[PDB]
Amino acid sequence: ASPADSQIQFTRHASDVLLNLNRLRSRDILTDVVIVVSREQFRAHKTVLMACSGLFYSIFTDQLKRNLSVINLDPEINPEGFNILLDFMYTSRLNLREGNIMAVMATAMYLQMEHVVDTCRKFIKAS
Amino acid sequence: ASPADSQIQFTRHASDVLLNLNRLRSRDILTDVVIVVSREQFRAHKTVLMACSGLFYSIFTDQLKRNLSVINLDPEINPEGFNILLDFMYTSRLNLREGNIMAVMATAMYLQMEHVVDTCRKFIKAS
Ligand SMILES: Cn1cnc2c(ccn2CC(=O)Nc2ccncc2Cl)c1=O
Ligand SMILES: Cn1cnc2c(ccn2CC(=O)Nc2ccncc2Cl)c1=O
Ligand SMILES: [Cl-]
Ligand SMILES: [Cl-]
């Protein structure tokens, strides 16, 4: 048996994987859900959503909901805030601005993305 | 518009995503293919396979093959070598040993994982 700890580490592999998953999203390859946010909608991979959000983890882990192909978010959720967070999921880069911080933060609370909410709080503290 | 370059970077996000995808694999959650390697078989997420391997990218990008639920690898492929590479895909950690290097290298050639083949060559050069 081989403990992963003594194995050879590839320091860019995880980031390469995420970039390639984002490339598949951009080509709509093997996306399996549409997220509807008021008048807008965004396709994604459920696995990535689950990996990044407590809300999506809790939805899709439940066998009752695992096969859903459409999720309607709460009508109060800002589509721009959601789009910023979806991009973050697939890139590790978060577009916070003075003009979007409150919407992004509220959306991250709803999506149960605790480290992102904490970063939003730090953005507030620094402005 | 916001260039990703000026956005806030989350330095552990990609690795967290990959760990969570591996956790889903371990629970067989949203896996959509079985890879058959002689007498053994391994379930996976096609998106991760595509992200990590030229062979799987070329198979699943083609609309002819995208919906396949079973892929039979070449009968000469060593299941242990394949298992090591599948683990690598989902962990960024490669278990090379003197006893497995040749099988892993040959399997990585077949899977079209060029950086892994290069690392196998370096392992050979160092022994
Ligand atoms: C509060 N909260 C809740 N869940 C979160 C985050 C950030 C990401 N996730 C998703 C997650 O942990 N997924 C996951 C866990 C275990 N096995 C498989 C998977 Cl896909 C957060 O801040
Ligand atoms: C030779 N070769 C060929 N392909 C490889 C590697 C290592 C990973 N991949 C998969 C890959 O690039 N996937 C991909 C590309 C573009 N858009 C989406 C995806 Cl999913 C390699 O060494
Ligand atoms: Cl598709
Ligand atoms: Cl499932």
For residue B26 and ligand 1, the question of a CB distance below 6 A is answered with no
Q: How far apart are CA B46 and CA B56, in angstroms?
A: 8
Is the distance from CB of B73 to CB of B35 less than 8 angstroms? yes
Contacts for B82 with CB less than 8 Å, ≥ 6 apart: B35, B37, B42, B73, B107
The CB density around residue A126, as the number of other CB atoms within 10 Å, is: 6
Largest alpha-carbon pair distance within chain A?
53
| DSSP β-ladder status, B8-9 and A93-94 | antiparallel
For residue B119 and ligand 2, the question of a CB distance below 6 A is answered with no
Contacts for A42 with CB less than 8 Å, ≥ 6 apart: A34, A35, A82, A83, A86
Q: How far apart are CA B123 and CA A49, in angstroms?
A: 37
Q: Is A93 helix (H, G, I), strand (E, B) or coil?
A: strand
Chain-centre distance of CA B107, in angstroms? 11
Atom number, ligand 2, closest to the C-alpha of residue B58: 4
Residue in the structure block whose two tokens are 């040749």? B102
Across the interface, whether the CB atoms of A10 and B93 are under 8 A apart is answered yes
Measured in angstroms, the CA of B110 and the nearest CA of chain A are apart by 19
A7 part of contact set with chain B, CB < 8 Å: yes
Q: How far apart are CA A111 and CA A107, in angstroms?
A: 6
Residue A95 DSSP label? -
DSSP for B10-54 reads -TTHHHHHHHHHHHHHHTT-S--EEEEETTEEEEE-HHHHHHH-H
DSSP for A22-71 reads HHHHHTT-S--EEEEETTEEEEE-HHHHHHH-HHHHHHHHSTTTTT-SEE
Q: How far apart are CA A107 and CA A86, in angstroms?
A: 11
Where exactly are the structural domains of chain A? Answer: 1-127
User: B101 CA distance to ligand 4 centroid (A)?
Assistant: 34
Q: In what order do the strands lie in the sheet with B33-37?
A: B40-44, B33-37, B70-72
Residue A20: name the closest of A57, A45, A1 by CA: A45
User: CB burial class (10 A; 0-12, 13-18, 19+) of residue A20?
Assistant: middle
Is the distance from CB of B45 to CB of B25 less than 8 angstroms? yes
Q: In what order do the strands lie in the sheet with A40-44?
A: A40-44, A33-37, A70-72
Residue in the structure block whose two tokens are 């590790």? A92
Is the distance from CB of B10 to CB of A90 less than 8 angstroms? no
In the beta sheet, which residues pair with residue B35? Answer: B42, B71
How many helices (H) and strands (E) in chain B? 6, 5
For residue B20 and ligand 1, the question of a CB distance below 6 A is answered with yes
Q: Chain B residues with CB inside 8 Å of A14's CB?
A: 14-15, 17-18, 92
Is the distance from CB of B81 to CB of B103 less than 8 angstroms? yes
Atom number, ligand 2, closest to the C-alpha of residue B47: 20
Give backbone dihedrals phi and psi of B84, rounded to 5 degrees, phi first: -60, -40
